[PDB]
Amino acid sequence: MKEFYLTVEQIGDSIFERYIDSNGRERTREVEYKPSLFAHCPESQATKYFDIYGKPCTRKLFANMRDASQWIKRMEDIGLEALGMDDFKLAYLSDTYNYEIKYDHTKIRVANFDIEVTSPDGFPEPSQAKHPIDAITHYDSIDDRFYVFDLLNSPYGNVEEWSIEIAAKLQEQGGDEVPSEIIDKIIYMPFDNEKELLMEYLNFWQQKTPVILTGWNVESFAIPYVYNRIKNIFGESTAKRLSPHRKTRVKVIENMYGSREIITLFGISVLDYIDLYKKFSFTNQPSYSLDYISEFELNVGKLKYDGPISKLRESNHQRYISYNIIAVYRVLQIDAKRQFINLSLDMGYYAKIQIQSVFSPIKTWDAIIFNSLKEQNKVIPQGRSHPVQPYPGAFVKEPIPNRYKYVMSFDLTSAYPSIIRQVNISPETIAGTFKVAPLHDYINAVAERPSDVYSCSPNGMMYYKDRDGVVPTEITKVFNQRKEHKGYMLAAQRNGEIIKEALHNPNLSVDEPLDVDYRFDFSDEIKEKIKKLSAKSLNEMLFRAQRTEVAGMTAQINRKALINGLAGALGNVWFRYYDLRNATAITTFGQMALQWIERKVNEYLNEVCGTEGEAFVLYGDTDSIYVSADKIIDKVGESKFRDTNHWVDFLDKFARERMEPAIDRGFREMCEYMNNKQHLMFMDREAIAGPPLGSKGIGGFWTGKKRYALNVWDMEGTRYAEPKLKIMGLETQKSSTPKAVQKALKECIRRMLQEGEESLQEYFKEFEKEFRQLNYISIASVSSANNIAKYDVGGFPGPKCPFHIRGILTYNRAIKGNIDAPQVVEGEKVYVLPLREGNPFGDKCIAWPSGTEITDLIKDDVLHWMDYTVLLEKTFIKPLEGFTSAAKLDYEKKASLFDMFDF
DNA sequence: CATGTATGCAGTCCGCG
DNA sequence: GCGGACTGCGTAC
Ligand SMILES: [Ca+2]
Ligand SMILES: [Ca+2]
Ligand SMILES: [Ca+2]
Ligand SMILES: [Ca+2]
Ligand SMILES: [Ca+2]
Numbered sequence: 001m002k003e004f005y006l007t008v009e010q011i012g013d014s015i016f017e018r019y020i021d022s023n024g025r026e027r028t029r030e031v032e033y034k035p036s037l038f039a040h041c042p043e044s045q046a047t048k049y050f051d052i053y054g055k056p057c058t059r060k061l062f063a064n065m066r067d068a069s070q071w072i073k074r075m076e077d078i079g080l081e082a083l084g085m086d087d088f089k090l091a092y093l094s095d096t097y098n099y100e101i102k103y104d105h106t107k108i109r110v111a112n113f114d115i116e117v118t119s120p121d122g123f124p125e126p127s128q129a130k131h132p133i134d135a136i137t138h139y140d141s142i143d144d145r146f147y148v149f150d151l152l153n154s155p156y157g158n159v160e161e162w163s164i165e166i167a168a169k170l171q172e173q174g175g176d177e178v179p180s181e182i183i184d185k186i187i188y189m190p191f192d193n194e195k196e197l198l199m200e201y202l203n204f205w206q207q208k209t210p211v212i213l214t215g216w217n218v219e220s221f222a223i224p225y226v227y228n229r230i231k232n233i234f235g236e237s238t239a240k241r242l243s244p245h246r247k248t249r250v251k252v253i254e255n256m257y258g259s260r261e262i263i264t265l266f267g268i269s270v271l272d273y274i275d276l277y278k279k280f281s282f283t284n285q286p287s288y289s290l291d292y293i294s295e296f297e298l299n300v301g302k303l304k305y306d307g308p309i310s311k312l313r314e315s316n317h318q319r320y321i322s323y324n325i326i327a328v329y330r331v332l333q334i335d336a337k338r339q340f341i342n343l344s345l346d347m348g349y350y351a352k353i354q355i356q357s358v359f360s361p362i363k364t365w366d367a368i369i370f371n372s373l374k375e376q377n378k379v380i381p382q383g384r385s386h387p388v389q390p391y392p393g394a395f396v397k398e399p400i401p402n403r404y405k406y407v408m409s410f411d412l413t414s415a416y417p418s419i420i421r422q423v424n425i426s427p428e429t430i431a432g433t434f435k436v437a438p439l440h441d442y443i444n445a446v447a448e449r450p451s452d453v454y455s456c457s458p459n460g461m462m463y464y465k466d467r468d469g470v471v472p473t474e475i476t477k478v479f480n481q482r483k484e485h486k487g488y489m490l491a492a493q494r495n496g497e498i499i500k501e502a503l504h505n506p507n508l509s510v511d512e513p514l515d516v517d518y519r520f521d522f523s524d525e526i527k528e529k530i531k532k533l534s535a536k537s538l539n540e541m542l543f544r545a546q547r548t549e550v551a552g553m554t555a556q557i558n559r560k561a562l563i564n565g566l567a568g569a570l571g572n573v574w575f576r577y578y579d580l581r582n583a584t585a586i587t588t589f590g591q592m593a594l595q596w597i598e599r600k601v602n603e604y605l606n607e608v609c610g611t612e613g614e615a616f617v618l619y620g621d622t623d624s625i626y627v628s629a630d631k632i633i634d635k636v637g638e639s640k641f642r643d644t645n646h647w648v649d650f651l652d653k654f655a656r657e658r659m660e661p662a663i664d665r666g667f668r669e670m671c672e673y674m675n676n677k678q679h680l681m682f683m684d685r686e687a688i689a690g691p692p693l694g695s696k697g698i699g700g701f702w703t704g705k706k707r708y709a710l711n712v713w714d715m716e717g718t719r720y721a722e723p724k725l726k727i728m729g730l731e732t733q734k735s736s737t738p739k740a741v742q743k744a745l746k747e748c749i750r751r752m753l754q755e756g757e758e759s760l761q762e763y764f765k766e767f768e769k770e771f772r773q774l775n776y777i778s779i780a781s782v783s784s785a786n787n788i789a790k791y792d793v794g795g796f797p798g799p800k801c802p803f804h805i806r807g808i809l810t811y812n813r814a815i816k817g818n819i820d821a822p823q824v825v826e827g828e829k830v831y832v833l834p835l836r837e838g839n840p841f842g843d844k845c846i847a848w849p850s851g852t853e854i855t856d857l858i859k860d861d862v863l864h865w866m867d868y869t870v871l872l873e874k875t876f877i878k879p880l881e882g883f884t885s886a887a888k889l890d891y892e893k894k895a896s897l898f899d900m901f902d903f
Numbered sequence: 904c905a906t907g908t909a910t911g912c913a914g915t916c917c918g919c920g
Numbered sequence: 921g922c923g924g925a926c927t928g929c930g931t932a933c
Contacts, residue, residue: 042932361906393908394933415933416907561906564933568906575905583907621909622933706932712918729911734930736913784929802928803914874913882912909933918928 004094004103006211008089008354009245009266013064015092016245017335018267021106028244033092035068036061038379039075051379052470083379085370093352093370097224101349110141110341111210112273115222118156118313123817126221127252127261129228132156132194134313135321136201137328139206146182146328147204149197151188159317161190171304182329198230200864202241204797209244211449212269212341212355215291216331219262219272235521243267255826256789264649268442269355269549273331276340279359280558284735286829287677287781287851294330297337302328308820309443334530337547339554361565362575368474369577380795381427386573391580393709394622395591397598399702401886404618406633407700407710408655409686410663412593414482414560417475419589424455424677426469428576434595436460437589442673445597449673456674459588461581465677472575475563477882482559488519489552493718495522496545496887498530499538500721506535513540518548538700577708580620593670593681594620599624600666601659609635619702624686627659633690643691648713655685672715687726688714696756701887703730709883711753725750731879740778741875748880748891757889764880764891772868779871781848785824807832807847814841821855824848834874839865 006018006026015033020026038049048710049057062068065088069164075082085091116135117124124131134151150162168183169175178186191197215222227248231239244267251262274288279612285292291302303323305312313320335341348355351367358364370380386764412418419425434450441447454462463469495518511534516526569575571583580751598617605616609631619626629651641647660683667681689710691697700710707729713720725746730736732746742768751759771779793800795813809825815821824830829850835841841862848854854862884891 360904363905365906391908396909396933513927565906568908571907572905587908626932704911728932729930731912733932736930800915800927879912885931907928907933912929914926914928917924919922 001027001104002099002102003097004101004282004349006095006108007267007269008093009247010065011245011247012265013066015089016267017092017096018244020104021281024104026052026107026109026116026295032063033088034062034326035065035091036084037068037071037086040081040083048377049379050377051286052373052381057379058607081382083382085380086383087366087375090353090367090769097299101352103345103349103566105342106142108141108211108345109208109212110212111138111208112328112331113138113213113215113218114139114324115225115311116324117225118154118310120156120310120819123262123823124225125258126224126228127259129225129232130643132197133226134194135324137324138139138201139328144185145207146186146325148186148188149201150188151197152190152192152541154176154194154313155190157314159313162188162318162321163686166318167325170887171361173556176319178322178325179329182325182417186325187539195233198233201226202238204228205242210268212271212344213526214271214273214276214331214341215328216273218785219270220260223265223270224261224263227260238674258358267818271344272357273334273340276344276522277334277338280340280554281338282341282557286739286831289851290327290330293799294334297334298330300330300333310820315539337550339551341588343554343558345412347558356885361562362569362572362813365474365566366576369470372470373765383574383576388573388579389580390800391571391584391587392591393444393587395594396622396705397617397620398705399619399626399708401701401703401885403698403701403889404628404630405699405818406629407618407650407688408627408629408651408659408689409624409687409689410627410655410659410683411686411708413682413684414479414563415590415593415623415818416586417479417563418680419586419593420475420567420678421472421479422455422468422671423457423585423589423674424465424472425461425465425582425585426463426471427579427582428799429463429467429469429472430581431455431464433460433696434462439592439595442592444526445596445601449675451675453675454623455676457585457589458467458592458674459584461518461585462740463677466676471566471582478559478563482556482563483554485555485559489556490547490716490718491521492518492545492549492552496542496549497718497721498522498527499542499545500596501541502530502533503538504537505531507532507537507769511537513537513544516541518545519552530531569760575612581790589674593667594625595665597663597681597683598625598669599626601663604659604662604666605631619708621706623683625683629654629690639694644690644713645719647689647690647693647721651688652714656689660685671880684716686716687712692723692754695754696758697754698889699886700758703882703886709753723754725753731875732882737879738779738781738871738875740774744876745879745883749883752883752887752889757770760884760889760891761893767876768872771872776833776863776866777831777853780874780876782829783832783847784849785826785828786829787845788824788826803845804830804832804847806843807845810835810846811848814846815855818855818857821857822849822852833862834867834870835862835865836867841865 001022004020009016011031013624015031016734018028021577031262037060038057041056043056045056047056047058049059051057058206072082072710084719114137115133117131118134132154133156136149139149149489152159167176167178171177184660199895200350227239240248243265246265249264294300304320307315344358345354346359346614352371353362353363353367373594389773396733401610431454437447450456451462514529515524567586570577570579572578602616606612606614616627617625618628632654642723668679671679689700689712691699691711702708702710712724727733732742747763748760751763760870785808788805790806791805792809795809797806797809811824830847832845832847833851834845846862880891
């Protein structure tokens with residue numbers, strides 16, 4: 001097999017590399033790496049090395065990495081560019097793996113772990129590690145085993161061995177419901193003292209050294225706690241055995257009352273699953289507890305136990321260990337669904353970076369571009385210092401706030417990357433400039449053609465048409481991957497709807513789910529077989545289709561994020577290729593493109609409808625247009641349609657056969673106007689939206705920029721079995737909006753869009769009458785706890801203190817002296833509730849860590865003093881008032897002359 | 904060490920015979 | 921008490 005790296009580190013003048021050899025064996029080596037850097041040289045000097053602007057360079061070969069870094073400083077002092085890759089491990093990887101990396105994940109040791117620590121005096125601080133580690137579960141991907149380390153004897157209590165028999169039993173039978181599919185994979189190791197537990201864990205660690213280290217909050221809790229606990233008991237060099245190269249770095253971040261630390265373990269790649277989740281999931285959660293996320297991702301119930309966690313080991317050691325095991329497994333389950341570890345490996349090896357550098361799009365792109373240029377013996381430019389400077393972004397149309405009955409939307413495929421490729425925007429493709437006219441002159445096609453030789457953007461930049469740029473070249477490669485995966489995702493989505501349609505008429509029979517590849521549209525023969533399947537088989541197939549869709553979403557959305565990230569990086573001062581000429585060439589082109597095509601669509605639709613001067617495009621944002629299709633439907637007459645699907649079909653066909661070609665002609669003309677390298681402005685239909693035929697539904701509404709709702713029947717070619725709401729920006733989509741309020745607001749929207757005003761009014765009345773009966777957590781607001789200390793003036797709110805921070809301070813006073821109540825952690829999220837005047841907390845609101853019940857001591861008072869009136873008004877009524885006034889209808893029946901009568 | 908800008912709403916402060 | 925500056929937060933791209 002071809003060799004591939006596992007980890008790489010620079011330690012002084014050595015590169016330390018863990019890798020897989022040609023036989024598939026894990027090996028480690030130390031290499032006294034001799035790096036090269038480059039200096040500009042005279043033309044008369046023959047060389048095979050050129051910088052990106054074709055200027056000759058001489059190679060400087062250094063005897064070591066320190067000599068290389070010292071030369072960099074001398075060059076800076078002299079005032080001359082020091083060219084080449086200054087991150088030497090990237091150079092090392094590029095030299096060592098001078099080919100496309102094909103990696104085998106089954107050879108990569110991925111470790112998932114979690115520890116337990118009983119603490120009778122508050123949260124167990126990792127930097128202090130003053131309490132015994134009393135459980136570790138460590139899952140090893142190569143063994144496929146859960147190694148469980150259980151402390152029987154502790155100063156906080158002596159307990160009996162954990163029982164796997166009881167663990168496997170249902171909870172309803174007093175067991176723990178440890179999932180049956182992992183029971184046989186548990187290797188249980190009880191210990192009579194912590195020292196033996198820890199020494200054995202380290203010995204185990206040495207035999208099975210993680211390459212990828214993950215788990216839930218491992219970076220901020222488990223890793224630093226294990227490190228510091230070992231340090232305190234055995235000494236720092238024992239703790240260093242956690243690094244295969246015996247080198248660590250301690251980062252002491254100043255939390256101020258108290259403090260915490262992050263440990264860097266050289267030769268391990270730590271990918272804390274919480275960080276993977278936040279970067280790759282594109283959700284924004286009100287809570288990041290593992291229980292909350294697991295419930296959200298997997299629909300498994302919260303792990304229940306009685307009393308505080310500090311008393312769980314002594315009262316119920318059986319459950320304590322089981323829950324430690326299950327927590328480790330839950331992360332694996334989330335990953336089996338989301339596939340973020342796979343994504344990370346994919347991207348890391350593609351870029352040739354340390355795997356943990358997938359968190360940094362700038363590092364990822366620096367590596368990709370470096371490797372690409374190095375292949376052509378080209379020499380990368382030195383990174384330079386730049387002041388931060390704001391620059392212009394996208395255009396967003398101001399919508400007239402209203403209900404909009406029929407709407408069709410269109411947007412550009414991968415807009416900014418497509419612009420990069422169309423215009424050929426790269427650091428080395430800049431050809432010069434032209435004199436800009438006002439943007440509106442380009443939009444209206446009245447400005448002078450910028451160039452008839454070069455490819456242009458209305459920001460004034462010109463690029464070579466007849467040569468490749470590394471940015472376009474490399475961005476295209478990742479786009480093409482993105483496109484492949486999005487294809488798989490949409491096919492799985494379409495396939496899911498076929499199964500949903502078939503579930504209407506299930507067969508009474510005993511059968512099997514069909515062995516199909518969900519990444520591809522079902523053939524007619526498969527469709528026929530599906531129409532004869534039972535409910536059971538259909539539901540399993542639907543589960544599989546949706547898992548395939550999710551896997552496709554992960555793969556495509558994060559490749560989309562990476563290429564969009566390159567466009568953004570050009571405007572980040574730390575990017576080697578930072579250049580506001582290139583950043584604004586993209587955004588200014590996007591502004592022109594949107595407004596150009598708005599003009600063209602208004603022109604086309606006026607012509608085909610036989611009118612003049614009517615505004616068809618009601619809204620747009622960055623690269624999208626929203627077309628009111630009322631006149632299209634009215635031209636044929638609503639009466640002609642058999643059902644909703646009939647008009648949906650009609651608009652679908654109208655968009656594809658009439659509008660899209662007109663849009664394409666419009667953009668081709670724009671491409672010719674800017675004399676661009678390649679026409680790539682592909683604006684495909686997104687949504688077809690409207691009310692159900694014959695209903696009083698309003699179809700859709702806008703309240704303003706970035707705030708709207710649509711009743712969608714077809715999305716990017718997926719014809720839904722049931723209409724689906726597309727809601728953007730409204731409170732239903734915000735993690736700060738109480739959960740039960742998101743639900744009620746969405747139902748209010750659904751009723752508005754599908755049923756009409758009377759239906760809405762009926763629901764509002766019910767919700768207002770039942771509001772006070774909702775669980776307090778379901779109606780609490782959510783906020784992020786930032787700069788708490790800033791506004792903390794002797795436990796009381798300072799000036800300009802935000803509402804949620806005031807809530808936190810109220811909480812800190814209420815829990816004072818009590819050692820057992822959970823602390824609000826800086827940066828994390830809190831539930832927030834308003835409080836009626838005269839309450840025993842002495843302020844207008846209270847806040848507590850999200851995803852939890854509020855501590856028992858004050859729960860009763862909070863419940864008694866919650867201000868329901870304020871809560872209903874602020875979270876529910878006020879937003880609903882915004883929706884309804886925009887849509888020109890009422891959530892409460894207005895008084896009228898008819899009130900004089902008895903109906 | 905190191906993706907971007909555009910943008911609405913809820914909050915505090917402050918003015919207001 | 922209401923509404924205009926000014927800003928934090930969360931979101932749409
Ligand atoms: Ca735990
Ligand atoms: Ca788009
Ligand atoms: Ca059937
Ligand atoms: Ca878009
Ligand atoms: Ca599309």
